[PDB]
Structures are given as C-alpha cells and as structure tokens.
From a paper:
Carbamoyltransferases (CTases) catalyze carbamoylation, an important modification for the bioactivity of many secondary metabolites with pharmaceutical applications. GdmN and Asm21 contribute to O-carbamoylation at the C7 (S configuration) of geldanamycin and ansamitocins, respectively. CTases in class III, which modify secondary metabolites, adopt two nucleophilic half-reactions, the formation of carbamoyl-AMP derived from ATP, CP, and Mg2+ and the subsequent transfer of the carbamoyl group from carbamoyl-AMP to the secondary metabolites. GdmN forms a face-to-face homodimer through unusual C-terminal domains, a previously unknown functional form for CTases.
Therefore, the co-crystal structures of GdmN/AMP/1 (2.80 Å resolution), GdmN/ATP (2.00 Å resolution), and GdmN/carbamoyl-AMP (1.98 Å resolution) were determined. The electron density clearly revealed that 1, CP, carbamoyl-AMP, and the nucleotides were bound in different substrate-binding sites. In the GdmN/AMP/1, GdmN/ATP, and GdmN/carbamoyl-AMP complexes, the electron density of AMP, ATP, or carbamoyl-AMP only appears in the subdomain of the Kae1-like domain, and these compounds make similar contacts with surrounding residues to those with TobZ. Further experiments indicated that GdmN shares a similar adenylation mechanism with TobZ.
Numbering used by the authors:
A (entry chain B): 1 to 680
B (entry chain A): 1 to 674
C-alpha cells in the first residue's frame, strides 16, 4: 500500500484559482507518502515554491515524494485529500460566485488536471478519497505517537464542521467522543487577536513569544467577557454582529490601540498578548480536565494548528492530567494531509500503521550526493571559499566553541515548522548577547523572543525541568522551565519567565546533530546549543543547496557547514556571474498614477510577488530596464552591459532585491537530479 | 434652519481609506440639504466622481448642494450621518487591524478633516449628529409621503443592529414597533442569490428584471429550505457554516451551476431568479399582512434598499393590505443620508417637515444657464452640429414619432436611480423592435432586460391597471399590469409577464416632460414613451453638460435634446481637439510576468480604474506612450505628435477607452460655475 496524502488549494505556480486568492484558503499545501504504514516522504510546498504557508497546489511536493520513494505516479495505490469533497467544492463554488470569470472546476477535476499535466499521471476516480478534516489530523497525531491507545484532541481554526474534536484512539481505530462548533474556534480566536498586534496569519508564534513580557492581569477581565467556561468541558465564545472578528469590537470600545506597522510593542500590546495566551490556556485546560476524567485515559495526543502553541503544550505537560503527551512535528494542515493518506488507506481496505514513535522530522528531499554537491559549490566559486575538513562535525563544534554562528545543512529537510538539525542555524547557547546578535544576522526583528535550545538526551535533565508527564521533545513541541540554577548559564535560550522551547536530540533522533551538540559540550562543559531555522525574514526554511548558499550569502552568518563542506563568503563576491530568473509569481511593473490638474502622474517602477500578501519594492529605472531583459540564461553581469555595466550601485540594488527573494539569483545551470544515495 | 445629511465612507478622490476598500463598505455616498423642513438639494457622489454606487466621501456632493441652496458652509446648523458613531468606528477599527499601515483615524476626525480640507469648513463637534440607520431611512420615506400617520417598513441589507425595522409614524414622531436581526436580512438574501447569476452588488434590479422570464415552480422547494414563515409576522432564514452566502451551498448540492461572465442566461438561471423573487415577495407580504392588521394603519411607507424592488412594490400595491403606499425615489442609503438630516434637526431643536408629498426627484445640479450652455456647445463644435428650434419640445415629439431615439437632458438631475425626464433616453414605446435594439445597440445590455414607460397622468388609466391601493408613480416605484387590450400597442414597454414599471408624469411632477409625452400622444394616438436612464454601461446617470455630450457621442443615440438645443454628431468628428485628462482613479501600467524558462515575460500595457471592482483594458505600446504625456491641457492631436500623429488606429483606440470612461476627453476648458 503506497498512498499519497494531499492538502492545500489547487492553484498553478504562476496564477491562483481566483485572482489574489486569500492566504487562508487552504494553506500550508504539502504532499506526504506512506508505504506499508510508514511515512516515507513528506515536504511542504512552501519549501519548493518559496512562498511561506503557500496555498498553491503541492505539485512539486508530490514529485519530490515520488522520487524519494522510487515510485512512478502510477505506483500510487490511493490518494487522500484532507477535507470532504462537498466541503472544499462548496468553498470553491463560493469563490466562483465571487469571480464569475473563473471556470467551474471543482476539486476532483482540479486534482486530476494538476497530476495529469504536471506528472503525466492519469488518476483513476476510484483512487481519490476525501477525508473528514479532524479525522486526518487525528490519524497523523496518534499513529506516530507509539501509543497503543490514547485520548486524541484536535484543535484548529476549523474543519468542515468543527473547530475542535475529541477522539478515543485504540489500535488503528478512532472513536469520536465530542466536538466543538466552528464559531467556538480557538484558532480563530487567536488569529483574530493576532491582528490587533499588527500581525497576521502565520504570526501566531510571534504573539506567543511576546506573551511572557506581558502582565495577563491587565486585560483578564476584558477577555473574560469574550468566553464562558461551562459544565461537562463545554465553553462558549461570545460573538458580535459588528465585524468578522471576535476580539476587536470590545477592545476598541475600551480604548485599545491596535499596533501600526513599524510601531514598537507598547506595554498594552505585551499585556494583550499575555492575556490572550492565558485565555486560550484556560479554555484548553478546561476541555482536557473534563475529557481526561471522563475518558479515564492517561495518554494524550494533541494535534491541529493550535498544537503548535508550545507554551500551551508545556502547561498541558505540567498539569499532571496525563502520564504521556505526544505532539507531531507538523500538527498544522500539512500533517492533516499526511493523516488523509492513512484515512484513505483505511477506507480503501486495511490500514497499516507505523511500527514506532516518530523521532525524526527529516523527511523532505535531501541536498544531493557528495559529487553533485561539490560540483555545484564549484559553480558558486566566484562568491564563496570552500574547505573540506576531514571531520566537519569536529571542526564545526570548535568553530561554535570560538563563538561563531553557523549555518548547518545536512540530509533531508524537516517536515513541519521547526528546524531540528537539517536546515538549522546554530550557535553557542550561553551568551545573552547572541539574541540581538543573531536577529541582526538574519535580519529578523524578534529580539523580544528567545531562541530555542537543543540539548543531548544524556544532559537534558541537567538543564531542563521535564517533570510532569513524559512528553516527546524531539520536535520542540513543549516549552519547559529551565532549572533555576542553570538560567544564567543559558543566557541566549532562556525566556524572561525562565522557560525554553527545548529540542532533546538523541543518537536515535539525529545522529550527526547529537554528535555535534555532545562534542560542543565536551569542548565547553555545556552540551546545549541554540537552534533556529535556516531562513532569513523573506523565505521559508531553505530546501536545496542553492537555497542554502543563497541564504548564507544574504545573511550575516559566519560560516556554513553543508554536507561536510565549510563555506565562507569571499571578501568581494562577484554578483555578476549569477543568472537572474523570474519566479512564477514575479511581476515587474512601470506605473503612472493620476497627477495634479488631471495629468498623468508620477512614473514609478516596482517589482512585486503576485500572491495575497506578497511583498513589493521600488526599483530604479536602470534596474527596471535591466530586469526587463532577464531571459533565464544570461548572467547578471552580461545583462547589466545593456545599461552601462554592473556598477556598485546596481549590484547593491540587485543584492537588496535578492535578500527579499523577488527573483532567483544563482549560477548558470543547476545541481541536477538528486542522486540515489542508496539510503532508501 | 439648514441641515446637511451625509452617508458613505471617508475616502479621498484618488485613494481609499484602506487599499482596495470593498465596494460594499458604506456605498452610494450622497449629500442632502434640508432648509426649513424642505429638501432643497440632493445628489449622489457617483454622479460627480462617475463611479457607480461609490463609497468615497461625498465632498463634491456637499459643495454642489451648498451652491444650489445659495449657502456657505458656515450657514449649516447641523450635519447628520446615517449610522451611529460606535458602529462605523468599529468597522473602521476592524479595517485598521487588517491594514496596519493605516493611521487610526475614526469617523468624527475623518468627516471633519474632509470638510476642513475640501470646503474650508471647520465643523464643531456639537453640530455633528450620528443617527440610527433605520431611523434615517424611515424619516426620509415617511416625511416625504404627505401622510400624517402611517406604518413605515424599512428593509435593507443591514443597519447597525437590524436588517429590518417597523415603525409607527404620527405627525413627526416615529415609534418602533418591531425589528429583525441581521442574519434575517432580505437584502443580504437577494444579494447572496444575485452572485449565483454572475452578477454583483448593484445588479439586483437586473435579477428582478430577469425573474418574469422564469418559472418560479422549478426551485420553489429548494428556496423553501432556506426560510420558514412563523406565526405573528415572524420568519427565519436558515443559515449555514460552510461559506458567507446563504444560498450557494444548497444550490450547489442540488447541481446548480453559477452563471459565468459573458455566458447566456439559461432557463435554469431564469427559473432561479423567478424563485428568488417569489421568495422575497412571500416573506415581505407575510411581514406586512401581520403588521397592517396589528398596527391598524391603512397607509404604508416603504424604504430601505429593498424598496427599490419595483416588482415587490407592485405586489404590495395589489395585495389590498393598505389603501395607500408611498416609496421615496432614493430608498437606498442615499435616502438614509437625507433622513439623517431630519434626525439631526430633530435632536437639536424641534423638527420641520415637508409641507407636501414629494413629486419631483429633480434635485441635483442643473446643466447651466442658456449662455454658458451655448458657449460650451460651441467648444464641442468639431464633433457636433447644433440646431436651436423655436419649440424644442414640439420638435422632439416629432422626431420621436419619426422613429428616432433621443437623449433628453434638462434642468436638475434625478436623485435616486431612476431617470424621470431630466437625464433620460426616450423612444417610441410601441414597436417591440425598439426594446430589442435599444437593449442591443444603444444601452448595450442583455436581451432579457425590460424597458419602463412614462405616461401622462391623464392617460395612465387608459393603459395601466393602477387599481388596488393608491401608490405614487412619479418615481417608477411600482410595477403594474399593462391593460391586456394595450399590450400589443405598447410593444417595447410591456414585459414578458404583461407588466411595466410605470412613470406617471403630470404637469406638477415634471411640466416639460409631461408636455413632451402629451404632444407625442397627440401626434401618434399613444401618450406613452420608453424612458431609460441616460448613461452607457460604463457610467452612472450623466450629470453635467460635458457628461451629456460625451455620453451622446459614445452611445448610438440619434439626436440629443439638451436645454432646447438639438445636438447631432458630425459626419466626421475631430477627436484631436479633445483634451485628455486622467480621472483621479486612472492608472497606466506596463507589466511583465514570468515567461518560459523563468525569463521575464513579454511586456503588456493596460489602463485601469483603481477602485474595488474597477475595470481594466489593454492598450497598445503607442497609446501607452501617448497617454504617459497627458498633462490635462494639451489636446489629443498635439499629444499624438510624439508618436507620429493621431492616426486612425490611435483615434479609434482612444474612442474605445473614452466609451469605457477610463479617462476624461472633452474640449479645452469647461462650462464654468453654474
Ligand atoms: N501558536 C498558536 N497558538 C494558537 N493558535 C495557533 C497557533 N498557531 C497556529 N494557530 C492557529 O491554527 C489554526 C490553523 O491550524 P491548521 O493548520 O490546522 O489549519 P485550519 O484552521 O484547519 O485552516 P483551513 O480551514 O484552511 O483548513 C489558525 O487559526 C491558527 O491561528
Ligand atoms: N431590487 C432589489 N431587491 C431586493 N433587494 C435589493 C434590491 N436592490 C437592492 N437591494 C438590497 O438592499 C440592500 C442595500 O440597501 P441599502 O442601500 O439601504 O444599504 P445597506 O444594506 O444599509 O448597506 P451597508 O452594507 O453599508 O450596511 C442590499 O442588500 C441590496 O441587495
Ligand atoms: Fe486543520
Ligand atoms: Fe440602508
């Protein structure tokens, strides 16, 4: 049984199913492949089209998954989609009523069209299975837990009919115990509140990082007007008829000022995040207290997008309601896509399940074989210097010991939002200074948020209070207290309230990364590193070798360790050898607005990315003329000759567009098809 | 005692409060001026910025109203705004959470900023009065009815708290009797369903025009699942949690396919419209049957946007529930703006009301005095020929009897969506072929669309069944049956179901238009004319003289009668003398997307109008370069010199953009102050 799991919307690479399709319309597109009950491959489309949390159809993800499994498309026994057919088709139909130019293509026809055109694959109708959304979440969360039975809680924005579902899991069977309707959504409540902080979809993790700086007392009584806890683990969220936001009218009535772009977080803002986080924690703990007692179960699996609230998970762990708690590395909708594969297998016959608890999220495409990596890094020679140490991990541990900040790229990319030693940025965890230092290097502005530590399994309890239940820490799912006598030692990874979102790495979960952190501890007496995702502010986690080198070159990292090669940026990198390529969403525009006295107004030039929420940037007339000639093969230096040569000013302008990923800049050609390293 | 009524959003001419602000966020912006209880001026901002049902702040409308009243901003005693302050501000606050770059400016500050920067008018806080939305509607509908007591029904999409309100009115006092919550909205229901026919906001009256072509039986049982009538005048609409549309999920599940743009209206689409119309009729008549007998009122005023459903109104008329029914010419939110003025007067003193029932909607700016109109028509000389007949009404009646289709522009423009003899297109009402052609060739719209007749008050009962209650027909508020023995005679203006949305014109409601219809009847035996609004498919009703001439020249009208001047298009009109001007929302774009092998794609050029729902059109590289040099003063002919002269191809390309109103093209100068 080889089963593909799908989630996301149905847009092509260069256009959306309707123009400017909202970023919340079936997001985090991904493809998963299960074989004989095991997750053999999984990657989010965002890693391949470079659009964070993309809604586009995960065609590249499917292609990559088939290649990792050594399968033709025609080898796939079934395809599961993470929503029931009537629901996704009703939402598409609604979009089609709003955009009457859009042809009436529903999900089944669109899935078949994408696979046929993108992969030559004629998908027979009987192989496509649509799945209840919280059922897909529950299979993913529970089947990877290693448990024989468990209480399973799914909380997200919404499935087809519910915002929350409670199951009993035993063997391979799910039994639904309860649900909560869409308007009680805790994901919706949290996203609603996130907007008041000048943030939006996908920034919830920043709001959760801000909450420890706030005093939850200030707005506790205000949030108390928006929910009521009830008997039998029930609750109500009190809506309004004013706007489609649960939170904004009451906070407006009380004088709250929603944060503007570029404005710093006031004390009101920090307090607001603290009270929002406390509110959700109290509601979820109210749910779980009731269902722990009523079901009598001692084990919990927690899935859905809300299960990426690691602060909440830490409190669930500390609550003593359960003996064990498991959280999947991709508990958002990409994991529901994975669960849809299992549900399709169950519906189309018999369900094989994983043999063991999941410990590694390293499931995407790799960087490539040793020989094509060396050759590709040679293509980059005019920008980088490369060394080949005999023991790269030893060298790297030493570099980190000296205080250098490292890019670290090895093997298959992480499924889910956390970097865990395959597409990571690692540094010494002790100096408090590394917080503002590394934010500046990657140009992120989350100095209020600490970094996450990775510690060896052997040393974990010497630094972190894992007490309460036995939770899984291979994926940073849980916030835990840092032992008080260790907080000063771990200055870069300890929050203001003494907690940390810890990864515990073991020889089983990540051999090479474990060896790195252990060796650093042997060298320093502290076997803890900070571990942040390898991406700047304008991209998801890097995927390919070119992605990795690009990100290294456009950030202020000291050195890059990639498949045992040490990469450093040349004193003066030659941008001119890079070949510019449009992304499918890249648009280059000359604009005239209306001027005074009804004249044609100012003539401006701009580059932007054509998707809901995509960035945009002004460009000079000269760079406009240069970029208009991009042909996908001619180098930047040769293109620049048409406008007088690649001056320092033009190169600087191009480099700033490169940092924001408006276009692709890389040496001519590519690394080639990823080698069969014989590890399957 | 002089009071301004305001409605709409707060956006400037060239940008919106937030980018691409939705077309439904406080639309149909307008301004009204009340003096001593009388409505002395009123105009919708759409007529002035040329954006249909615009949401932009009605600055031009306020300026035009003050000019018509002969008043200065300082003379205004109070300003009413047609929604409560907390509600509009909470909506703005919500928009600001979605657009973190927008500064936190709420309605009080925005209204004062617009009036200060736009009119030099420093409005004190104590003169600005915010009004309950359905109260504003009710004042407008009731105070203009001529009645001293009535039941008043307001039905729209929503006010701040309700989708429907029932009032008792006595003297100048309103007392609420009932209201209906927002989820029960009949305006929302109708708009939800309108989207399944490939239409959008503002297209509801086209759905209503489609419905008589359909069989209401086909989808009657489907619609029955979406509402329940309950005892004592109550009802329920049955919502869903799938999408924010009440209608589309159930019809999707039963296999209905929403109409695509540019595709025909099938019999299923017709049947859908028929069942939707029947549904709203059944619910409203249910409400009214209860509240008529419960309140004891023999007279009804009906307002809110749903009261522009002429078919519904005609059924209310025929129901026997009331002896008299009144409907205001602007029953949508522009009329709520007017009622907000009365409500503001009532809160700051006692309330003066109109002395009589409103008979004329001729309330906007006029076209100009005779001298400036003749002078402006001379500026258009390279494009038109002008005659000055001794008796233009006499001449126009003869032209109509000879088969000509006429533009008709006189005096002050109509408040509200209907043309009533001040900004009208008229033709012989007798030949069915006139409907076919004026739909296909003149208005350029769908073949199913009906045309409305105007008839003299003295002949009305010779042609139409007005029986039932006494309704007011001066504003085309009611669909009525055409008498069976007259249906063949009135071929262009009798709908497929034998009805007509009639205007009854009298010497008192419109002396000049009444004279035209009467004379046509004396020449032909039939005192009835086809009367459709004077606008092409890309614009609201024309306002100014330049608007009128532009529309005449870009639609296939035979002759224009404007303030007693007979205008015809020249054999070969010289477009080169016209001076192009950008509209405040006009944008010009050269664009590349990605191309094969991740190249930059080939260049394309577009003109577009930068507002939500604004059109766009491809342009040639040559015209892109030409339009980039527009300065607002240089003629098209001189501009074209930079691209080698106004060729025939360029002039034709420019003509098509003019027709779609992407830019303003008119002779140098303007008509001056009116
Ligand atoms: N750290 C967090 N704390 C609270 N809520 C979060 C957090 N992270 C994500 N969420 C919420 O989870 C929800 C998204 O979860 P999920 O990925 O399972 O998709 P979804 O709600 O089912 O969307 P769709 O309707 O398109 O399927 C959002 O509402 C989001 O605000
Ligand atoms: N012929 C019609 N039949 C039924 N409903 C109509 C018709 N014409 C307009 N409507 C409805 O009237 C409603 C609008 O009425 P109105 O102008 O009074 O504004 P509103 O609902 O108060 O606007 P807002 O969105 O700002 O609250 C819309 O829902 C519209 O669908
Ligand atoms: Fe989900
Ligand atoms: Fe209204």
């Amino acid at each position: 049984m080889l089963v593909l799991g799908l989630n996301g919307n149905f847009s092509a690479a260069d256009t959306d199913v309707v123009p400017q399709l909202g970023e919340v319309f079936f997001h985090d597109s991904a493809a998963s492949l299960i074989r004989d009950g095991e997750l053999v491959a999984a990657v989010e489309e965002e890693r391949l089209n470079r659009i964070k949390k993309t809604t586009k159809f995960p065609l590249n993800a499917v292609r990559e998954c088939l290649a990792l499994a050594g399968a033709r498309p025609e080898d796939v026994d079934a395809v599961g989609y993470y929503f029931p057919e009537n629901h996704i088709d009703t939402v598409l139909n609604h979009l089609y009523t709003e955009y009457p130019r859009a042809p009436l293509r529903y999900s089944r026809e669109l899935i078949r069209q994408r696979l046929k055109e993108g992969l030559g694959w004629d998908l027979p109708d009987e192989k496509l299975v649509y799945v209840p959304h919280h059922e897909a979440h529950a299979y993913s969360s529970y089947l990877h837990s290693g448990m024989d039975s468990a209480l399973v809680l799914v909380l997200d924005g919404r499935g087809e009919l519910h915002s929350g579902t409670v199951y009993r899991a035993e063997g391979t069977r799910l039994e639904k115990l309860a649900d909560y309707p869409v308007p009680k959504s805790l994901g919706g409540l949290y996203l609603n509140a996130t907007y008041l902080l000048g943030y939006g979809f996908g920034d919830e993790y920043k709001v959760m990082g801000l909450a420890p700086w706030g005093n939850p007392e200030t707005y506790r009584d205000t949030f108390a007007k928006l929910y009521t806890l009830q008997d039998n683990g029930e609750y109500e969220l009190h809506g309004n008829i004013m706007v489609p936001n649960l939170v904004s009218p009451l906070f407006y009535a009380e004088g709250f000022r929603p944060r503007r772009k570029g404005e710093p977080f006031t004390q009101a803002h920090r307090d607001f995040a603290a009270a929002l986080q406390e509110t959700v924690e109290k509601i979820v703990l109210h749910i779980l207290e009731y269902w722990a007692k009523t079901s009598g179960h001692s084990r919990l699996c927690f899935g859905g997008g809300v299960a990426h609230n690691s602060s909440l998970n830490g409190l669930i762990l500390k609550s003593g309601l359960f003996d064990e708690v498991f959280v999947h590395p991709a508990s958002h909708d990409a994991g529901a896509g994975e669960g849809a594969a299992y549900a399709a297998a169950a519906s189309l016959g018999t369900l094989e399940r994983p043999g063991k608890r999941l410990l590694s999220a390293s499931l995407g495409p790799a960087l490539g074989g040793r020989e094509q990596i060396r050759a590709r890094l040679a293509d980059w020679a005019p920008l980088i210097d490369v060394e080949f140490p005999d023991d790269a991990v030893e060298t790297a541990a030493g570099l980190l010991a000296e205080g250098q900040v490292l890019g670290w790229a090895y093997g298959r990319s992480e499924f889910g939002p956390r970097a865990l030693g395959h597409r990571s940025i690692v540094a010494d965890a002790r100096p408090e200074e590394n917080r503002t230092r590394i934010n500046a290097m990657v140009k992120k502005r989350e100095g209020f948020r600490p970094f996450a530590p990775v510690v060896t399994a052997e040393a974990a309890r010497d630094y972190f209070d894992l007490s309460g239940a036995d939770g899984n820490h291979e994926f940073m799912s849980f916030v835990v207290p840092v032992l008080p006598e260790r907080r000063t030692e771990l200055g870069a990874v300890t929050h203001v309230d003494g907690t940390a979102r810890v990864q515990v790495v073991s020889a089983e979960s990540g051999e090479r990364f474990h060896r790195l952190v252990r060796r650093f501890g042997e060298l320093t007496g502290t076997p803890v590193l900070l571990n942040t995702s390898f991406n700047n502010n304008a991209e998801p986690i890097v995927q390919s070798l070119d992605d990795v080198v690009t990100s290294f070159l456009t950030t202020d990292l000291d050195v890059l360790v990639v498949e045992d090669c040490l990469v450093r940026g040349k004193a003066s990198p030659d941008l001119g050898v890079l070949v510019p390529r449009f992304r499918p969403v890249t648009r280059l525009v000359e604009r005239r607005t209306a001027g005074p006295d009804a004249s044609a107004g100012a003539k401006t030039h701009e580059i932007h990315l054509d998707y809901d929420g995509g960035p945009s940037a002004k460009v000079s007339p000269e760079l406009y003329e240069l970029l208009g000639a991009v042909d996908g093969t001619t180098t930047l230096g040769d293109l620049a000759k048409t406008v007088g040569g690649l001056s320092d000013a033009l190169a600087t302008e191009v480099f700033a567009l490169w940092e924001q990923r408006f276009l692709t800049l890389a040496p001519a050609g590519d690394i080639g098809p990823l080698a069969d390293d014989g590890t399957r």
